[PDB]
Amino acid sequence: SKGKLGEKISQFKIVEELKAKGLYAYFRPIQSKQDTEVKIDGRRVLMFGSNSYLGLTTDTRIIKAAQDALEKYGTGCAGSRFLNGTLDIHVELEEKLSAYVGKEAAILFSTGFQSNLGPLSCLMGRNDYILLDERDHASIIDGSRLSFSKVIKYGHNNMEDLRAKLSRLPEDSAKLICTDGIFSMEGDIVNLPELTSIANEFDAAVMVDDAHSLGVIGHKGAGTASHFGLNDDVDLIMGTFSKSLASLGGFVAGDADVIDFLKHNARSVMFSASMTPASVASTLKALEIIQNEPEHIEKLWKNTDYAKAQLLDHGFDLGATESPILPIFIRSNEKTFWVTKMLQDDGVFVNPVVSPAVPAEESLIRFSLMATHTYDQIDEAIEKMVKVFKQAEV
């Protein structure tokens, strides 16, 4: 029955307003492979809003690996890993990931999102605590909420606030600190040396979400612990396959005893169907390519350094990025929607960040680099961005 349900959704009008003004640019329907240019409505659009940092979703070797896995294994495993959903190739991928991030063991999940839900929901319980950076990804907030623990947020990269909040807590309790490695909004890196120093003082577990770090920072792209040399101070390394690894799915890597507990206690792996064979194969081949072909990471950072310098030289106001995420401040929600749509209509795809995700005065567009971008494409996007920021009067 719909009476109260209709009332619950009645006040949500921002989408009707964006559509009526001709500003709507969510769920833009792409007609082609994710690449430096995509086809939208039959026309070519430069893609600066992707998470495919190494451009690997179009690698013919990766497509072929996925197609060969369909031929051998079919379209799906039709069950949880726990029951009838495990393939030899899932186990192979766990072994290869464990080696890549320097841990004993790993467990796959069918999404990155579900990779966060698993350990956050089942390790800390009643009378225990989870400490979260306030900018942590939605999946981390949701995972922690599924736990029976007390969830405490600390100020963004604020080690005094983390330390104080941990100091308040009863000694006879378990504590788990979970952080993004690279934060997607501003593209900044966690203070992992200080956070792990605090964790070691209070015997808290440390979990890092490396969604935006894998294939980006660390030796051969192995992520945030690898970047800082702090593998031995991080209990759990979470990753997704949907970004540099060009696929779908995720993982959690750690000590074999903790991983064995997770694979038999995390509801998001016990009660969800396993990754498709095509996605296991594509992830395995992308992981081989990231490690054996240092070019990709190198070219990603040449593009990042080039685009960042060009944006600062044109007078754009950038956030405190340390990654291929270039946050360009606009500081008005209306201007952010307008700039986004005008760029779309001129052949440039960027992602807006607006209220209520952020305060109006912190609204921005995120311009993300891909190893496969050219300096010519970067130049064309920035040319168009200068013109639209002028038209918009930013």
Ligand X SMILES: Cc1ncc(COP(=O)(O)O)c(CNCC(=O)O)c1O
Query: Which residues does the annotation mark as catalytic?
Result: 184, 212, 243
Binding test (CB under 8 A) with a copy of itself, winner from 213, 226, 247, 321: 247
Nearer to ligand X by C-beta: 209 or 235? Answer: 209
180 is in the binding site of which of ligand X, a copy of itself, none (Cβ under 5 to 8 A by kind)? ligand X
Nearer to a copy of itself by C-beta: 189 or 280? Answer: 280
How far are the Cα atoms of 94, 211, 280 from residue 68, in angstroms, in the given order?
20, 27, 11
287 is in the binding site of which of a copy of itself, ligand X, none (Cβ under 5 to 8 A by kind)? none
Q: Which is it for strands 129-133 and 175-180: parallel, antiparallel or unpaired?
A: parallel
* Number of residues forming the site for a copy of itself (CB under 8 A): 113
Is 304 a residue that touches a copy of itself (CB under 8 A)? no
- Name the residue among 12, 21, 1 with its Cα closest to residue 340: 21
Instruction: Give the whole-angstrom CA distance, residue 373 versus residue 348.
Output: 13
Stretch near ligand X under the rule CB under 6 A, chosen from 66-74, 193-201, 268-276, 309-317: 268-276
- Name the residue among 85, 102, 119, 93 with its Cα closest to residue 279: 93
Dmax (CA) for the chain in angstroms is 62
How far are the Cα atoms of 34, 151, 236 from residue 175, in angstroms, in the given order?
40, 10, 14
Is 223 a residue that touches ligand X (CB under 6 A)? no
Please, what is the minimum distance in Å from the beta carbon of residue 91 to ligand X?
18
Binders of a copy of itself in range 118-177 (CB under 8 A): 121, 123-125, 128, 137-139, 142, 145-146, 173-176
Please, what is the minimum distance in Å from the beta carbon of residue 241 to a copy of itself?
8
Contact 110, 273 (CB under 8 A): yes
Nearer to a copy of itself by C-beta: 240 or 321? Answer: 240
Contacts for 258-264: CB closer than 8 Å, 24+ residues apart: 258/123, 259/104, 259/105, 259/106, 259/107, 260/105, 261/122, 261/123, 262/107, 262/118, 262/119, 262/122, 262/123, 263/81, 263/82, 263/107, 264/82
Stretch near a copy of itself under the rule CB under 8 A, chosen from 88-96, 97-105, 154-162, 295-303: 88-96
Run of H or E including 159: helix 159-167
Binders of ligand X in range 112-171 (CB under 6 A): 112-113, 116, 137, 139
Binders of a copy of itself in range 317-376 (CB under 8 A): 349, 351
Instruction: Give the whole-angstrom CA distance, residue 11 versus residue 30.
Output: 30
80 is in an annotated binding site: no
Sheet with 105-109: strands ordered across: 105-109, 250-254, 236-240, 205-209, 175-180, 129-133, 150-154
Is 180 a residue that touches ligand X (CB under 6 A)? yes
* Number of residues forming the site for ligand X (CB under 6 A): 19
Binding test (CB under 6 A) with ligand X, winner from 111, 144, 336, 377: 111
**Closest residue to bound ligand X by CB:** 112
Is 56 a residue that touches ligand X (CB under 6 A)? no
212 is in an annotated binding site: yes
Both tokens assigned to 341: 């749509």
Instruction: Please identify which residue in the block is written with the tokens 């109260």.
Output: 4
Name the 3-class secondary structure at 107.
Answer: strand
143 is in an annotated binding site: no
Contact 224, 189 (CB under 8 A): yes
329 is in an annotated binding site: no
175 is in the binding site of which of a copy of itself, ligand X, none (Cβ under 5 to 8 A by kind)? a copy of itself
99 is in the binding site of which of a copy of itself, ligand X, none (Cβ under 5 to 8 A by kind)? none
Nearer to a copy of itself by C-beta: 22 or 390? Answer: 22
How far are the Cα atoms of 18, 55, 244 from residue 67, in angstroms, in the given order?
40, 19, 19
Stretch near a copy of itself under the rule CB under 8 A, chosen from 96-104, 155-163, 263-271, 309-317: 263-271
Instruction: Please identify which residue in the block is written with the tokens 């604020």.
Output: 158
Which residues define the annotated binding site for pyridoxal 5'-phosphate?
112-113, 212, 240, 242
Which residues define the annotated binding site?
112-113, 212, 240, 242
Give the footprint of ligand X on this chain (CB under 6 A): 80, 83, 111-113, 116, 137, 139, 180, 184, 209, 211-212, 240, 242, 250, 271-273
